[PDB]
RNA sequence: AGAUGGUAAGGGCCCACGGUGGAUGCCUCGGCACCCGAGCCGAUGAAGGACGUGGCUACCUGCGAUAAGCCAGGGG
RNA sequence: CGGGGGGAACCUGGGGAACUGAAACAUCUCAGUACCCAGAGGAGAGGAAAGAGAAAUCGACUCCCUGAGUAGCGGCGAGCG
RNA sequence: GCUGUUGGGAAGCAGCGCCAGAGAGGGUGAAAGCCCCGUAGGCGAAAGGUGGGGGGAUAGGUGAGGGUACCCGAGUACCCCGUGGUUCGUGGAGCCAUGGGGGAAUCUGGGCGGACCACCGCCUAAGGCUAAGUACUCCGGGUGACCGAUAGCGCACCAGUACCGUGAGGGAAAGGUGAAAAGAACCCCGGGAGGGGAGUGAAAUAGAGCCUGAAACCGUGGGCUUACAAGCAGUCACGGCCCCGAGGGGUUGUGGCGUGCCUAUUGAAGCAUGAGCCGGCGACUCACGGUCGUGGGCGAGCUUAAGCCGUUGAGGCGGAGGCGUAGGGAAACCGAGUCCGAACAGGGCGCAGCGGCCGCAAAGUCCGCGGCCGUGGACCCGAAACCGGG
RNA sequence: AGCUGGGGCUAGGAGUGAAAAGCUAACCGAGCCCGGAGAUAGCUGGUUCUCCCCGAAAUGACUUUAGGGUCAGCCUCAGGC
RNA sequence: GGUGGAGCCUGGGAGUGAGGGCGCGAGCGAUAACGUCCGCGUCCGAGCGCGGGAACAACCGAGACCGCCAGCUAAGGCCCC
RNA sequence: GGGAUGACCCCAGGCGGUAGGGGAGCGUUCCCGAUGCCGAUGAAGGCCGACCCGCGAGGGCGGCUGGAGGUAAGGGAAGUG
RNA sequence: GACCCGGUGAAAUUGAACUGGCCGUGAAGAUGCGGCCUACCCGUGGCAGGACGAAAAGACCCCGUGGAGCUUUACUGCAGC
């Protein structure tokens, strides 16, 4: 039915893997069919565009790369630690994302 | 005969023990290592559990080196399998009463 | 022991025997199959236990003996089994039709007949028949025979 | 499927205790006049059939 | 007096690299076999279709002039 | 109020071959199978003894095992069962 | 579950820890119990559907002796004639069914127990209904000593499609860049296609006509060799040149020898068959039964089948039954004997472990394995033809 | 007794046929498709790795049998004498 | 006497049942046929592997496990090839 | 014959071969072994090899390609050349 | 048209080819065996003597206990009368 993000734009998470792996930054877009993540300077690559009027002069224009969610991990705001998501039932009776390290909570 | 010719082997070598019951083990695979290591169960060998409390076979049986068994289902093949075989009384008395 | 340690005795898991694969195994081409033939074609021959090719058989030209049976079919009359005194040595006491069948001595359905090729022991026995040699040897030996009805 | 016990046989011949085919002797259906007394004496009585041919007759009985 | 080499129009064998071609190896949404579950639809117009349908739309899907969709309840 | 038509096979009823096997072939077999038609349903058929058949007994029907390739059937041939 | 480390990337190797009713599996830049989707273990439905289990209703259910002799399923039972079903092919031919003819009875009735008669017994036709246990698999799910793009469904891809046929009907071929498009801006030769640098990438003979890229087939360069030779083309010896560092590799001038492969044949190089070449598919199996052999288990005893329970790649139960323990005879029937026979005659088919109670061996039987046989397409491909419905 | 467009009817042991067994969707002594179906084929062909030991027959008898088969003969393997 | 891939017995698996040349004994044929039909034997078949025979399955020689730039022989050969 | 048993050693003899019988092995797909071992310091596959062990079918070693899989001793089952 | 030049570019066939003649031989009609003669390597336009040339698993002939059409005082059945 839907895919699971454990992680939403654009809360801050851990670059867990990959070549800018430890880097942290804002979520700047979900992608879930891929099923993958564009984080803010994260997985940076130089692509080339056409003398076109948008871009005039030709050259190239680095983009922002999408991740596999698999690499990308939350930062708790409290503890500011990286951690699993659970899920707490508050008594509304709704479901919070709140960090595993502490019980903090991560919008 | 195949399944009293199988322990026997188990017991030439005395790689086979009995236990009169598992101490405190109440269905977490913890509360078992514990136990296993004061049974001389380093898990440097593989395991036969055979018993039928069935919340000691709860605690082992996600252990990569134990493989669990209602005494009523003990067969050769998995003894062969393992390097060890455990059992209560209980299995042990069973055991007799199907090789008899 | 251990899985590894798990051979068969040896020759009891024989290979297999392939014909048609090469010069070497001496079964290729005509697979071990003659040339030409209807033996060598597929389906092959007739049932060779009883056709010859043709003459009339050797069974077809023999004799047909005593009554083969007729519709609505078999009769139904008592049938006997005989057990001989040899046999009954095992038991002591009291032999009867039953635990000569739970033994493995005698079917169901069949009657109990006695037979004297062995020696008698004093015991009662109870059967359906007994031979003239198994009565003499029977009573002699300090039995009690017992018919039934 | 299993094997059908033939009948053809099973009407002719008789498998004894240690393993040979006896069948009845040909000769005295019929055309018996001028026979002689020793002829017509002696086929009326059973003959063990030749080892070859038995082995097949036998074949043909697997549940007797 | 005599005797013996170098030519290669092209051919042949051998090594090197490529062209063509798509075997082989790994892969797999798909297919096969068994066990279980489940089992009718339809004049309240079925099964299956035609023609249409998007701001730009060849085909596929989805839908029906309310046409990738309208209402309501539940989930997320 | 109901019917009509569709459904991959499965089911019951009305009809129903042949190659082939019999080392030819006609009875026989292949087989009431393949196929056609009507019908039904999630199942259909069958089903509460005017039964079986020798136990002086069994107790509707359906299905599987077994009885058994037994009893019997058959140009007593092939084979059927 | 972090770190450190090589690396394009860590899940790899090292150090120190942790969970486990979860170490099934699949993903993540490679090989992750603890990163993501999940797994064990638990939760869950306002509305439609189902509801064979639970509770409640309702239609429906029920006595005994005595006399009465009204009823008790009609062109039916019953007889014959013609058929069908049953194991029954007219057979001694009953039973069930019925197209034709004749044609009753109501318990003192009638059908049945294999023609018929009697005795004894079983049943109670000619109206109907009836769950489950049973069969199939368009559908959904789980699982495989099932396939892995000539395989597996005819289709892994826009397939019952393109294309063939008037029509029923026939019926394909075709998958893969990379971790991520970051899919090559810009400049250069060219009309373009295509390429040459630049640039990306760990890798660009991974450049989209893309993973690996074999073989036939084609071509460029190099070494040896060839224009007086002859031949199934190769083999042996020698010699010359080239390469590699008393030896080896490639090549071939001369001398010797030499009638392809397969097939079918008395016999082929054979002017007998098949094959242009290469790559892939391509033919002795399976189930039941039988018969020898074999490794084991038990052994006058061996063994269960469908099923019931258990398990969720756990096994155990189940003795109905089958083979064996006795054979001979057409059979009654006798039985270690029996049959032909008057026979105590003669003949046919039959009849009887090893050491010191023990152990060991065995008739037999059971599962495995193997060869062979029977039944089915039964080693693979191939007819001309028969038949049925369209 | 002509030729011809258009609308129609007749079909598989059946149709049409100024008759040739011609025609019936480019091969008609019984059309085509699909099915029974993997019909049958005692005929031809084809049957895929290696090494090791032995090693045939093309005879006789019967055979609607003669280019196929049953038994014996000659080969082979295991056990026994 | 003979200890041989000799023989007897029981049992499993086959293939063969289209032979051909030579020599001797015959028939048939013409005291023909690379003709045909039997008998004893031999060889090829299966030794189309080797030597001789100019070359050639069966005439002479001789039964090939493999390797040698060692020796002796059989048929047949010794002027040259 | 040793020695005791397939330990390897010595002596002697056998070993052409179609149909065909028999025996011992190689190799391919798959399963247990395997929650294991091999693998990015490079799996399977592919091109070379004049080297190693094997009678041979085949098995290792090395170099280039290749870029994520492979799978031992010992056994089991086949869509096995 | 054929033949030369530029542009496009098939076919059946094809064991692999390094493919001469004569007298002999051989499964009896040899480019491929034996002896001898001849012959420098590769081509183009031509002619058809041989590769028992190509094509179609001989229409003829026989074989098969193959088929099918036609026939009758062959056998046995059915419609029909
Ligand atoms: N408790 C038991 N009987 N366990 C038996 C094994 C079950 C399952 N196959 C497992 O490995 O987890
Ligand atoms: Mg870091
Ligand atoms: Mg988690
Ligand atoms: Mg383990
Ligand atoms: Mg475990
Ligand atoms: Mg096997
Ligand atoms: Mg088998
Ligand atoms: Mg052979
Ligand atoms: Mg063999
Ligand atoms: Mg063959
Ligand atoms: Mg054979
Ligand atoms: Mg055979
Ligand atoms: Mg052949
Ligand atoms: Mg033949
Ligand atoms: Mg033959
Ligand atoms: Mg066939
Ligand atoms: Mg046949
Ligand atoms: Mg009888
Ligand atoms: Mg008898
Ligand atoms: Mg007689
Ligand atoms: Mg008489
Ligand atoms: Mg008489
Ligand atoms: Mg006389
Ligand atoms: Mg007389
Ligand atoms: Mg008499
Ligand atoms: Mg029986
Ligand atoms: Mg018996
Ligand atoms: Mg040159
Ligand atoms: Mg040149
Ligand atoms: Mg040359
Ligand atoms: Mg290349
Ligand atoms: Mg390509
Ligand atoms: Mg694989
Ligand atoms: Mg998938
Ligand atoms: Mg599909
Ligand atoms: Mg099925
Ligand atoms: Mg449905
Ligand atoms: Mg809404
Ligand atoms: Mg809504
Ligand atoms: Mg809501
Ligand atoms: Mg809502
Ligand atoms: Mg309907
Ligand atoms: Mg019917
Ligand atoms: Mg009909
Ligand atoms: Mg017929
Ligand atoms: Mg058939
Ligand atoms: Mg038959
Ligand atoms: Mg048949
Ligand atoms: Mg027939
Ligand atoms: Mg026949
Ligand atoms: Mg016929
Ligand atoms: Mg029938
Ligand atoms: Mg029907
Ligand atoms: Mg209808
Ligand atoms: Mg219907
Ligand atoms: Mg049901
Ligand atoms: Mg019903
Ligand atoms: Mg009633
Ligand atoms: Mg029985
Ligand atoms: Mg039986
Ligand atoms: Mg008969
Ligand atoms: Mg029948
Ligand atoms: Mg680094
Ligand atoms: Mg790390
Ligand atoms: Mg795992
Ligand atoms: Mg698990
Ligand atoms: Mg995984
Ligand atoms: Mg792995
Ligand atoms: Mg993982
Ligand atoms: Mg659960
Ligand atoms: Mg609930
Ligand atoms: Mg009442
Ligand atoms: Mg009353
Ligand atoms: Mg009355
Ligand atoms: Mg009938
Ligand atoms: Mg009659
Ligand atoms: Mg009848
Ligand atoms: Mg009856
Ligand atoms: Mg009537
Ligand atoms: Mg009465
Ligand atoms: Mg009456
Ligand atoms: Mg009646
Ligand atoms: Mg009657
Ligand atoms: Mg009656
Ligand atoms: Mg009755
Ligand atoms: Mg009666
Ligand atoms: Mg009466
Ligand atoms: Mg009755
Ligand atoms: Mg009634
Ligand atoms: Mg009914
Ligand atoms: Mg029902
Ligand atoms: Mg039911
Ligand atoms: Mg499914
Ligand atoms: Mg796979
Ligand atoms: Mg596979
Ligand atoms: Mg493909
Ligand atoms: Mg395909
Ligand atoms: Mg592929
Ligand atoms: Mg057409
Ligand atoms: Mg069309
Ligand atoms: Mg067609
Ligand atoms: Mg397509
Ligand atoms: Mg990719
Ligand atoms: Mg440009
Ligand atoms: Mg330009
Ligand atoms: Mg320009
Ligand atoms: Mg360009
Ligand atoms: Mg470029
Ligand atoms: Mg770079
Ligand atoms: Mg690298
Ligand atoms: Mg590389
Ligand atoms: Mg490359
Ligand atoms: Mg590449
Ligand atoms: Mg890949
Ligand atoms: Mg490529
Ligand atoms: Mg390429
Ligand atoms: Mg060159
Ligand atoms: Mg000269
Ligand atoms: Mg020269
Ligand atoms: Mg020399
Ligand atoms: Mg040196
Ligand atoms: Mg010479
Ligand atoms: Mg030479
Ligand atoms: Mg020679
Ligand atoms: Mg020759
Ligand atoms: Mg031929
Ligand atoms: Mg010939
Ligand atoms: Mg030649
Ligand atoms: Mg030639
Ligand atoms: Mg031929
Ligand atoms: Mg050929
Ligand atoms: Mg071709
Ligand atoms: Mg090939
Ligand atoms: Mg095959
Ligand atoms: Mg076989
Ligand atoms: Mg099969
Ligand atoms: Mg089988
Ligand atoms: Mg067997
Ligand atoms: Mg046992
Ligand atoms: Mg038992
Ligand atoms: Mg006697
Ligand atoms: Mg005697
Ligand atoms: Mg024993
Ligand atoms: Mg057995
Ligand atoms: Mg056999
Ligand atoms: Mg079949
Ligand atoms: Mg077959
Ligand atoms: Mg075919
Ligand atoms: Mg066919
Ligand atoms: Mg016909
Ligand atoms: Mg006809
Ligand atoms: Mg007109
Ligand atoms: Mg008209
Ligand atoms: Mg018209
Ligand atoms: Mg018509
Ligand atoms: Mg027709
Ligand atoms: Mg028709
Ligand atoms: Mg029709
Ligand atoms: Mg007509
Ligand atoms: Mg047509
Ligand atoms: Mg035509
Ligand atoms: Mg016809
Ligand atoms: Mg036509
Ligand atoms: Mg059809
Ligand atoms: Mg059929
Ligand atoms: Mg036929
Ligand atoms: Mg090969
Ligand atoms: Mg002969
Ligand atoms: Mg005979
Ligand atoms: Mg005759
Ligand atoms: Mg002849
Ligand atoms: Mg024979
Ligand atoms: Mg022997
Ligand atoms: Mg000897
Ligand atoms: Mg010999
Ligand atoms: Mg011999
Ligand atoms: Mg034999
Ligand atoms: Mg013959
Ligand atoms: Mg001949
Ligand atoms: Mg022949
Ligand atoms: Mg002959
Ligand atoms: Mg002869
Ligand atoms: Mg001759
Ligand atoms: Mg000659
Ligand atoms: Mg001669
Ligand atoms: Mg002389
Ligand atoms: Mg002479
Ligand atoms: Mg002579
Ligand atoms: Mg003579
Ligand atoms: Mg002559
Ligand atoms: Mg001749
Ligand atoms: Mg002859
Ligand atoms: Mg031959
Ligand atoms: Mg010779
Ligand atoms: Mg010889
Ligand atoms: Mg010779
Ligand atoms: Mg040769
Ligand atoms: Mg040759
Ligand atoms: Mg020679
Ligand atoms: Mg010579
Ligand atoms: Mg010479
Ligand atoms: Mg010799
Ligand atoms: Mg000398
Ligand atoms: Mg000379
Ligand atoms: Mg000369
Ligand atoms: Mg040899
Ligand atoms: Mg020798
Ligand atoms: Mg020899
Ligand atoms: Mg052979
Ligand atoms: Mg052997
Ligand atoms: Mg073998
Ligand atoms: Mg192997
Ligand atoms: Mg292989
Ligand atoms: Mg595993
Ligand atoms: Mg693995
Ligand atoms: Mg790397
Ligand atoms: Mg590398
Ligand atoms: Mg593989
Ligand atoms: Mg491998
Ligand atoms: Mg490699
Ligand atoms: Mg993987
Ligand atoms: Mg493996
Ligand atoms: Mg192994
Ligand atoms: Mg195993
Ligand atoms: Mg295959
Ligand atoms: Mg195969
Ligand atoms: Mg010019
Ligand atoms: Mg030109
Ligand atoms: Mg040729
Ligand atoms: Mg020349
Ligand atoms: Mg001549
Ligand atoms: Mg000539
Ligand atoms: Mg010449
Ligand atoms: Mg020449
Ligand atoms: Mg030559
Ligand atoms: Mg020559
Ligand atoms: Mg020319
Ligand atoms: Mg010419
Ligand atoms: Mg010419
Ligand atoms: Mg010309
Ligand atoms: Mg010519
Ligand atoms: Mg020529
Ligand atoms: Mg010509
Ligand atoms: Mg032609
Ligand atoms: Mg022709
Ligand atoms: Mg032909
Ligand atoms: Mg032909
Ligand atoms: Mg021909
Ligand atoms: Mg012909
Ligand atoms: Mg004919
Ligand atoms: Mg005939
Ligand atoms: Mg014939
Ligand atoms: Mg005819
Ligand atoms: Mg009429
Ligand atoms: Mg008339
Ligand atoms: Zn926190």
Redesign the pocket.
């Given at each position: 039915?839907?895919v699971?993000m454990?992680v939403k734009k654009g809360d801050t998470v851990l670059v867990?893997?990959?070549?800018?792996?430890?880097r942290v930054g804002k979520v700047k877009e979900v992608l879930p069919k891929?099923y993958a993540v564009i984080v803010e300077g994260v997985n940076i690559?130089?692509?080339?565009?056409?003398?076109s009027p948008k871009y005039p002069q030709?050259?190239?224009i680095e983009?922002e790369?999408?991740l596999?969610?698999?690499?990308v991990?939350p930062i708790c705001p409290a503890c500011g630690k990286?951690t699993?998501?659970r899920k707490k039932f508050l008594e509304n009776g709704k479901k919070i994302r709140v960090c595993?390290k502490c019980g903090g909570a991560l919008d | 005969?195949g399944?009293a010719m199988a322990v026997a082997d188990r017991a030439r070598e005395g790689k086979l023990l009995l236990v009169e019951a598992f101490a405190g083990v109440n269905?977490?695979?913890?509360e078992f290592?514990a136990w296993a290591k004061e049974a001389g169960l380093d898990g440097s060998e593989?395991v036969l559990l055979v018993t039928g409390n069935e919340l000691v076979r709860?605690?082992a049986?996600?252990?990569?080196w134990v493989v669990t068994?209602?005494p009523?289902?003990?067969?050769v093949?998995?003894i062969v399998?393992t390097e060890r075989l455990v059992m209560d009384l209980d299995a042990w008395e069973v055991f007799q009463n199907?090789i008899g | 022991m251990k899985?590894?340690?798990?051979?068969?005795?040896?020759?009891?898991?024989?290979?297999?025997?392939?014909?048609?694969?090469?010069?070497?195994?001496?079964?290729?081409?005509?697979?071990?199959?003659?040339?030409?033939?209807?033996?060598?074609?597929?389906?092959?021959?007739?049932?060779?236990?009883?056709?010859?090719?043709?003459?009339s058989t050797?069974l077809?030209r023999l004799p047909?003996?005593?009554?083969?049976?007729?519709?609505?079919?078999?009769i139904?009359?008592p049938r006997?089994?005989?057990?001989?005194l040899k046999?009954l040595a095992?038991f002591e006491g009291e032999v009867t039709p039953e635990l000569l069948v739970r033994?493995?001595?005698?079917?169901?359905g069949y009657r109990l007949?006695i037979?004297?090729?062995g020696e008698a022991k004093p015991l009662k026995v109870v059967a359906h028949?007994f031979?003239?040699?198994?009565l003499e040897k029977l009573k002699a030996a300090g039995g009690e025979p017992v018919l039934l009805e | 499927?299993?094997?059908?016990?033939?009948?053809?046989a099973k009407?002719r011949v008789?498998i004894?205790?240690?393993?040979?085919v006896?069948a009845m002797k040909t000769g005295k259906r019929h055309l018996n006049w001028q026979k002689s007394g020793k002829e017509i004496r002696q086929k009326?009585?059973?003959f063990?059939l030749?080892?070859?041919?038995a082995?097949?007759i036998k074949?043909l009985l697997?549940?007797e």
């Open positions: 039915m839907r699971k454990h867990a893997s990959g070549k800018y792996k430890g891929k690559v130089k692509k080339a565009v056409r003398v030709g050259g190239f983009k790369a999408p596999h969610a698999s690499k991990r990286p699993r998501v595993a | 005969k399944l269905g977490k695979t913890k290592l593989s709860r605690a049986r996600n252990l990569p068994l209602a009523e289902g003990l067969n093949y998995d399998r199907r | 899985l590894s340690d798990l051979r068969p005795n040896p020759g009891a898991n024989k290979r297999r025997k392939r014909v048609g694969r090469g010069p070497g195994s001496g079964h290729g081409k005509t697979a071990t199959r003659g040339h030409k033939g209807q033996k060598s074609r597929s389906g092959g021959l007739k049932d060779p236990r009883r056709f010859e090719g043709g003459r050797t077809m047909k003996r005593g009554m083969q049976g007729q519709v609505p079919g078999e139904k009359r006997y089994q005989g057990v001989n046999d095992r033994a493995g001595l005698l079917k169901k007949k037979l004297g090729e028949a031979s003239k040699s198994a | 499927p299993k094997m059908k016990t033939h009948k053809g009407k008789k004894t205790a240690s393993g040979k006896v009326g009585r059973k063990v030749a080892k070859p041919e082995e097949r074949l697997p549940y």
